[PDB]
Amino acid sequence: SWLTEEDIRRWESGTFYDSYRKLGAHPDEEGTWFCVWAPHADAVSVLGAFNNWDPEAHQLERYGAGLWAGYVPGALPGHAYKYRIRHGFYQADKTDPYAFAMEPPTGSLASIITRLDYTWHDDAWMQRRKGPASLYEPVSIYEVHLGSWRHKQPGVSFSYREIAEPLADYVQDLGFTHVELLPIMEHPYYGSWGYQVVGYYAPTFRYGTPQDLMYLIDYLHQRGIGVILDWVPSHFAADPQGLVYFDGTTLFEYDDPRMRHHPDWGTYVFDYNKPGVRNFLISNALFWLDYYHVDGLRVDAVASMLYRDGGRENLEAIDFIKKFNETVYLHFPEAITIAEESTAWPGVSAPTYNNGLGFLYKWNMGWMHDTLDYMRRDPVHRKYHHDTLTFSLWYAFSEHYILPLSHDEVVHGKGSLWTKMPGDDWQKAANLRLLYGHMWGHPGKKLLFMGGEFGQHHEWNHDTQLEWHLLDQPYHRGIQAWVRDLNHLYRTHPALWHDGPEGFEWIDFNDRDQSVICYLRKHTDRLLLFVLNFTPVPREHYRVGVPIGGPWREVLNSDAVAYGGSGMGNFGRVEAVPESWHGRPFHLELTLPPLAILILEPE
Amino acid sequence: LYRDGGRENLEAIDFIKKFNETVYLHFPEAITIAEESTAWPGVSAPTYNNGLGFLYKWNMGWMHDTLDYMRRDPVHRKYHHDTLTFSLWYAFSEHYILPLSHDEVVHGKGSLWTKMPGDDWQKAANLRLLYGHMWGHPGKKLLFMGGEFGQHHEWNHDTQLEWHLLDQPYHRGIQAWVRDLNHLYRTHPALWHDGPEGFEWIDFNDRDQSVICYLRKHTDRLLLFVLNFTPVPREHYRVGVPIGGPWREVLNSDAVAYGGSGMGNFGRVEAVPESWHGRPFHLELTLPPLAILILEPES
Amino acid sequence: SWLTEEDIRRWESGTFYDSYRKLGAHPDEEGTWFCVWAPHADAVSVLGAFNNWDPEAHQLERYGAGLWAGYVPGALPGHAYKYRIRHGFYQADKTDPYAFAMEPPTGSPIEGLASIITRLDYTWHDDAWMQRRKGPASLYEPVSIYEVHLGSWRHKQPGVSFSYREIAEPLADYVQDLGFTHVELLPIMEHPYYGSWGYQVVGYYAPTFRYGTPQDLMYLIDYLHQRGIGVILDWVPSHFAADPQGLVYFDGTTLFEYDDPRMRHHPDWGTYVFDYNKPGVRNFLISNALFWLDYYHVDGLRVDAVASMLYRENLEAIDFIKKFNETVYLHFPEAITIAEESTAWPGVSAPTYNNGLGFLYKWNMGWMHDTLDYMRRDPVHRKYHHDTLTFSLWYAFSEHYILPLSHDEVVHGKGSLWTKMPGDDWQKAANLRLLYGHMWGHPGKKLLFMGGEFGQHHEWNHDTQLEWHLLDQPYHRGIQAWVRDLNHLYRTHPALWHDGPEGFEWIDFNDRDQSVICYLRKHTDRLLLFVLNFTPVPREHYRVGVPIGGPWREVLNSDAVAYGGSGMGNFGRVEAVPESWHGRPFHLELTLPPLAILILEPE
């Protein structure tokens, strides 16, 4: 026995979330054990150099629940293999779904017997990770495709170990708390960015071995940065050598023909009704959280799982999503789960016991759409569209949200964030500085995709690296400085940490003509005041009500020339005039620079 | 609000706000309620929060969904369980008044009674069940004329309500059920607070048997709601509870006084200290057909 | 060798429309030739009992155009075979796309279908039929199609269908008794899932094993021809079946499916659409159309879900469709092509040189939807939807249409045709006869699916035989008798043969309250008058204008007792009255029976 009679009983239930240890390829000192799930197969064999690639020499023997196991003496680490499964008349060669390492034979993929031995250097980090408590702390996420970020030479990506020290510094210099990694799991078409997955249990070869990635996380953890992984339980890759019709029949697929056709992915969706699929998917969740200590998982296209598009909603997926999150937090109390759901499915970020999906965070795609839609327009146009801006807060507390500017918004002709912004180059730079300033002020956590911080003109290209030649140009350097300052203010002031309705107060929302909004962020005693000038006309003697009187400080000036503005600043310690304005006992009479944001803190 | 620049009529939006501001200034204890079937936000919120300034909003979402679920035959209610349970994701967006009105009983939409499926006893049971849920659900209560007897025809203004129906048992019974429902509402402060603190889920996944349990609490006070939306009675049904000890059922929709089958829990229901639905103790109860059970711990 | 230089030249062009002459398995008395198209394969071999299923015994040789060929001595008819294709690291067993017969070696209900070496030799005796057969000219001849699922039609024993031979005599006898001109058979091409009804095809060149050998099917068609019945085949070029050894990823890469990742996503099928850009796909598909018309003497081909082909606009699909029809009628001038297109795509039934798709016929689904919708209503309410009935004539001449009642319309809870009609059993049968009466009177050819002719209660269940036991009851034998007499009228009276606008005249449409319709069907001197009462209330002294005066006879009355009706009618001769009505010189004063159609002829 490789497999306990109990382990099979757990498989029948779909309650083995440690299935990785039983399944896949496991080296011992004299050979390796192979274990594959192929219930509707008549025979399963492992073929490799260790047996001259002959099906007969090593054939796996079925145990309970369509689970095949066998030992091959002489099977060694670094060996390539493939499973040859026979479904009656026909035979086919397959990859190991639980392969912990895949390397292409061409060098342009074959499962490799691998050992995941690694000794960690992040003990200190894990003890301090916030998880659910992170809701009351700042999260500022830097989204990255490792291949696109930095290059050694054109068309040559950075390795896992190599990128760590350059990336960790850049992330630290800007004060981000976490990096969200576009899917690292093995995928054939690099142009997919990782979203069509073949090796759910294998990190991509292009950046190194499993150990190379483990260290990258080790380093990022030691340097105080969190790592969030993008996860694709919604669908599986099209290529046949992979998961498609694995046992010769539908396996990860829906057995029934009606359910299998689906929008976006057809016959490539996971059958969450099957217990084996749930084992496979939920085990992978912990596998990444366990063997690689990942801090978070971000689930994309949650709407595609929830709906089928009798009940239109897919309950199998809905309970799977709920039990996925339930398992994560029971096994890892400080893990972090994020969902992107482009529907108003309620309680995505809500606990399962309240009928929620159980994520900690939901991408605020409403905010993103509204915000981008508002600022795409001309400032003269903005006064008509001003309500779009202010009404963002009517939806800002429905869920635990992360305000998100993502890679997808910077592709497919939508234009770089820079490109979207209106006017001349100075006004465009101001508008992006205003955008990010307002985004850090808006309640909710923050995520920015690569290149937004230096305002790169080009749309994100995976075959290229971001335009660092722009870091030299002044406006781009100023936008980088502005983002770093906002993160520093975010890291320090607790008023921005509490994204609850308690944490936000409106000061003024009705300057519809000059497109100005004043609002407040409070936690307990501490206060921060936000004045946003969304039109290029500067305003002097503009009065803004305040709760508290006394000396007020200008904590940040979007137009401070250090960011590339006209340099127009109050440049003074403001004193609250005890004459009421905006229904407040006091008011500040301030100067609003063009397309600029002032953040004011009491002294 | 909408004429359909933008679609919004800001004239009207400022008029509505200045309307509410003026009323509450001159009459601080007046009440303004709005019916808005768009999802315009913060209708019940103060103007200084960018709201329209009404104190109350009719919960048209609750009614449409709730009515749609009640109309479906109980055999099918299995498949629309998410419709009933999901109403509470929206029950706290505004200060809400759950409303059943003349508009729902006109122009061929049918009497509330007519809206209910099944045989005659079942129509009264379903109609009694709905009102139980309307009172248990968070939010204030509004019911239009004739629904309290469960009158048969749509509201006809050129004529009188069907008062003769008050002699038949099923209809005098729904009137009795509403009377006691209002009495429970008036006396128990657990129902006065329509905020999220005032509501707790007990269990929502009995989707095959179409059973729903929720709690309405203010401080010490608790009220337990168990709803059987199928004509099958359920026996030895366990329902988690926060506190143990003696519990009594203060209301049973299926009581004979209302025209019901007469099953229920007569004797003291004592909590069993075994965890259920993630709760420390549990009650093993009998759920009557198409009935709502309201339970209070004993003091 | 096996492939001449001309054969490879045509295949590269996309012009090899007889490709079965060379592709697939071709037996010789000593051995069998094998030829399979797999351009992206590094190795391909034939496996069979004839070589101990050893892959290295017979590796086919790469010729040009990605074509592989090889000869195997000792491979004989009835031997089972499989292709073993190696795509770099991975190998897979695949079926022959050009298989001339497939069989489950297992005999099991769920089983792999294995390609079997087959000889297609057969001597035909359908001389008279094919020399007098008329395709495109059938536009001016009566076409009445009986749509059939061979397994579902009649059972020889419970759960056992009839052979191609065993069904031959019973089916021909039944169709002749009811007077249909053609039978349309749901796809007989080899399909894995019996529940697919044949629309998921694996062996396009192989008749399904369930009903016998190829020669059995050729015999069935031969027999039907001698009996004077035409055979229309359902053909599925829109999509192929998802089976792992089938056409999916044939050479290890995309072959029959679109190479591009994006234009693979398809709402109806996706991933399994044919890439009409490829000359090889065009070869495979267009040859198959000709293959059935040639080797199986088929009279017609009906393509379903054409809307799934035209849109993704797919110019390549449309040019495929156009070159399909052009090529068909080029090789078989008396063939028939029918299309069902669920969009209002114009000119389906139009010739290619007029910018049409080139089919001879289009299914009139507009007619089907409206009529059923109108008759689903109770006679009390039909008063308010009168335009739904009459307005069908605004659309009756846009194409050469076949009014269609199909299996699609009597399954998946849509209800049997009997079930669809309102009222008590007498009224449902009365209404069904009226619907059949109107469908035969309305312009266009006629199609009726099995079980509608007796008005079967239950929805069509493919696992069972039609409820023939219902033929004992009076209503059901009557509806069947009514259909027979309608078909007798159709075949003899040429007024119904011309579905052109010349062939139809309105007599009255404004009787909305009483829900009555009078329309006229004419060819030259010949006339047919139609009076329809869609309410169970009979109307007496109803005047109906007529073009010609004089004696009129009532040739058919749906309400005759022989059909299961009340027995009201206009006894024998009717004499036109020289007083004007409906803008006509004469009129007949008639008695209109309940829910009945009268068909009247001048004497």
C contact residues 93-122, partner A, Cβ 8 Å cutoff: 93-95, 105-106, 111-112, 114
CA C320 to chain centre: 20
Q: Minimal CA–CA distance to A139: which of A478, A505, A443? A: A443
Question: Which residues from chain C sit within 8 angstroms of residue A87, using beta carbons?
Answer: 112, 244
Q: Minimal CA–CA distance to B118: which of B74, B169, B69, B173? A: B74
B230 burial via Cβ count (<10 Å: 0-12, 13-18, 19+): middle
Element (DSSP H or E) covering residue A85: strand A80-87
In this structure, the strands spanning C504-508 and C573-575 are unpaired
Instruction: Name the maximum alpha-carbon separation found in chain A.
Output: 92
C-alpha angle with apex A459: A457 to A462, nearest 5 degrees?
Answer: 130
Are A248 and C244 in contact (CB < 8 Å)? yes
The secondary structure of residue A387, as a DSSP letter, is H
DSSP letters, C418-453, are HHHS-SSHHHHHHHHHHHHHHHHHSSSEEEEETTTT
Contact C34, C69 (CB under 8 A): yes
Question: Counting one residue from A and one from B, how many pairs have CB atoms under 8 Å apart?
Answer: 35
What are C27's two structure tokens?
């037996």
Query: How many whole angstroms separate alpha carbon A96 and alpha carbon B283?
Result: 50
DSSP letters, C521-580, are EEETTEEEEEEEE-SSS-EEEEEEEESS-SEEEEEEETTSGGGTS------SEEE-BSS-
Contact A590, A544 (CB under 8 A): yes
Count each helix (H run) and each strand (E run) in chain B, helices first.
Answer: 7, 12
**Resolution in Å, one decimal place:** 2.9
What are A508's two structure tokens?
């003024």
Q: Is A40 on the interface with C (CB under 8 A)?
A: no
Element (DSSP H or E) covering residue C183: strand C182-185
| Residue C222 CA: distances (Å) to CA of B129, C298, C560 | 68, 9, 38
Are B41 and A391 in contact (CB < 8 Å)? yes
A contact residues 314-373, partner B, Cβ 8 Å cutoff: 346-347, 353-355
Q: Is B195 on the interface with A (CB under 8 A)?
A: no
Are B201 and A355 in contact (CB < 8 Å)? yes
Contact A474, A433 (CB under 8 A): no
Question: Which residues from chain B sit within 8 angstroms of residue A314, using beta carbons?
Answer: none
Identify residue C283 by its one-letter amino acid code.
N
What are C595's two structure tokens?
């829910």
Are C82 and A93 in contact (CB < 8 Å)? no
Query: How many whole angstroms separate alpha carbon B177 and alpha carbon B143?
Result: 13
Q: Which residues contact C472 (CB under 8 A, 6 or more apart)?
A: none
3-state helix/strand/coil string of C225-249: HHCCCEEEEEECCCECCCCCCCCCC
The secondary structure of residue A433, as a DSSP letter, is H
Nearest residue of C to residue A82, measured between CA atoms: C90
> What is the helix, strand, coil percentage profile of chain A, to 5?
30, 25, 40
Are A384 and B48 in contact (CB < 8 Å)? no
Nearest residue of B to residue A505, measured between CA atoms: B49
User: To the nearest whole angstrom, how far is the Cα of B6 from the nearest Cα of chain A?
Assistant: 7
What are A343's two structure tokens?
């529907």
Contact C331, C367 (CB under 8 A): no
What are A90's two structure tokens?
């026909």
Q: Which residues contact B267 (CB under 8 A, 6 or more apart)?
A: none
Q: Minimal CA–CA distance to C39: which of C16, C17, C68? A: C68
Q: Give me the residue from A106, A189, A248 closest to C261, CB to CB.
A: A189
* Residue spans of alpha helices (H) in C227-314: 279-295, 306-310
Query: How many whole angstroms separate alpha carbon C306 and alpha carbon C320?
Result: 12
The secondary structure of residue A209, as a DSSP letter, is -
Question: Counting one residue from A and one from C, how many pairs have CB atoms under 8 Å apart?
Answer: 81
A81 burial via Cβ count (<10 Å: 0-12, 13-18, 19+): buried
Nearest residue of A to residue C193, measured between CA atoms: A257
Identify residue B125 by its one-letter amino acid code.
A
For tokens 């979203």, the residue is A195
Q: Minimal CA–CA distance to C475: which of C491, C490, C487, C457? A: C457
Q: Which residues pair with A203 in a beta bridge?
A: A185
Question: Which residues from chain A sit within 8 angstroms of residue B41, using beta carbons?
Answer: 391, 394-395
Query: How many whole angstroms separate alpha carbon C182 and alpha carbon C170?
Result: 15
CA dihedral B18, B23, B26, B29 (to 10 degrees): -140
Are A92 and C196 in contact (CB < 8 Å)? no
Query: How many whole angstroms separate alpha carbon A400 and alpha carbon B252?
Result: 39
Query: How many whole angstroms separate alpha carbon C438 and alpha carbon C436?
Result: 5
Contact A595, A431 (CB under 8 A): yes
Contact A251, A39 (CB under 8 A): yes
What are B181's two structure tokens?
């429902």
Helix axes C214-226 and C164-178, enclosed angle (nearest 10): 20
* Residue spans of alpha helices (H) in chain B: 10-26, 60-71, 74-77, 81-85, 112-115, 120-136, 169-187
| Residue B55 CA: distances (Å) to CA of A393, B58, B62, C392 | 20, 10, 18, 55
Question: Which residues from chain B sit within 8 angstroms of residue A583, using beta carbons?
Answer: 48
Query: How many whole angstroms separate alpha carbon A134 and alpha carbon A128?
Result: 11
Query: How many whole angstroms separate alpha carbon C203 and alpha carbon B214?
Result: 58
For tokens 């730079």, the residue is A429
C-alpha angle with apex C568: C567 to C574, nearest 5 degrees?
Answer: 125
User: To the nearest whole angstrom, how far is the Cα of A350 from the nearest Cα of chain B?
Assistant: 10
Question: What does residue B183 show for φ and ψ, rounded to 5 degrees?
Answer: -60, -45
Contact B225, B292 (CB under 8 A): yes
In this structure, the strands spanning B211-218 and B221-228 are antiparallel
Q: Which residues contact C286 (CB under 8 A, 6 or more apart)?
A: C17, C320, C323, C324, C327
What are A97's two structure tokens?
């779904």
Contact A239, C248 (CB under 8 A): no
Q: Give me the residue from A88, A189, A238 closest to C112, CB to CB.
A: A88
Question: What does residue A314 show for φ and ψ, rounded to 5 degrees?
Answer: -95, 105
Contact B178, B158 (CB under 8 A): no
Q: Give me the residue from B6, B90, B278 closest to A387, CB to CB.
A: B6
Identify residue A288 by its one-letter amino acid code.
W
Query: How many whole angstroms separate alpha carbon C342 and alpha carbon C276?
Result: 21
The secondary structure of residue C162, as a DSSP letter, is P
For tokens 């007969």, the residue is A56
Query: How many whole angstroms separate alpha carbon A87 and alpha carbon B24?
Result: 77
Q: Minimal CA–CA distance to C78: which of C51, C44, C101, C97? A: C101
Are C92 and A240 in contact (CB < 8 Å)? yes
Identify residue A63 by its one-letter amino acid code.
Y
Query: How many whole angstroms separate alpha carbon C496 and alpha carbon C442?
Result: 8
The secondary structure of residue C273, as a DSSP letter, is B
Query: How many whole angstroms separate alpha carbon A20 and alpha carbon A23?
Result: 5
* Residue spans of alpha helices (H) in C338-448: 365-376, 379-382, 386-390, 417-420, 425-441
Question: Which residues from chain B sit within 8 angstroms of residue A390, using beta carbons?
Answer: 50
In this structure, the strands spanning C102-103 and C361-363 are unpaired
Identify residue A77 by its one-letter amino acid code.
P
In this structure, the strands spanning B140-143 and B246-252 are unpaired
In this structure, the strands spanning B234-241 and B221-228 are unpaired
Are C92 and A189 in contact (CB < 8 Å)? no
| Residue B234 CA: distances (Å) to CA of A166, B75, B281 | 65, 15, 20
Catalytically active residues of B, by annotation = 35
Q: Is A90 on the interface with C (CB under 8 A)?
A: yes
What are A547's two structure tokens?
């709760």
User: To the nearest whole angstrom, how far is the Cα of A208 from the nearest Cα of chain B?
Assistant: 45
Query: How many whole angstroms separate alpha carbon B173 and alpha carbon B81?
Result: 28
Number of C-beta neighbours around residue A553 at 10 A: 15
Q: Do chains B and A touch (3 or more CB pairs under 8 A)?
A: yes
Q: Is C92 on the interface with A (CB under 8 A)?
A: yes
SS3 A342: coil
For tokens 């465009």, the residue is A428
C158-173: burial string, b at 16+ Cβ within 10 Å, e else: eeebbbbbbbbeebbe
Q: Is A87 on the interface with C (CB under 8 A)?
A: yes
Question: Which residues from chain B sit within 8 angstroms of residue A387, using beta carbons?
Answer: 6, 8
Q: Which residues pair with A403 in a beta bridge?
A: A446
A510-518 long-range contacts, Cβ below 8 Å, gap at least 24?
A512/A383, A512/A386, A512/A387, A513/A383, A514/A383, A514/A539, A515/A379, A515/A382, A515/A383, A515/A386, A515/A389, A516/A542, A516/A592, A517/A389, A517/A390, A518/A544, A518/A545, A518/A582
Question: What does residue A466 show for φ and ψ, rounded to 5 degrees?
Answer: -60, 155
Query: How many whole angstroms separate alpha carbon B224 and alpha carbon A525?
Result: 39
C475-479 long-range contacts, Cβ below 8 Å, gap at least 24?
C475/C425, C475/C426, C475/C428, C475/C429, C475/C564, C476/C429, C477/C564, C478/C429, C478/C433, C478/C562, C478/C563, C478/C564, C478/C565, C479/C429, C479/C432, C479/C433, C479/C436, C479/C453, C479/C454, C479/C455, C479/C563, C479/C564
For tokens 């001003």, the residue is A386
Q: Is A387 on the interface with B (CB under 8 A)?
A: yes
CA B36 to chain centre: 19
Question: Which residues from chain C sit within 8 angstroms of residue A261, using beta carbons?
Answer: 267-270
Q: Minimal CA–CA distance to A36: which of A317, A243, A271? A: A243
CA B214 to chain centre: 12
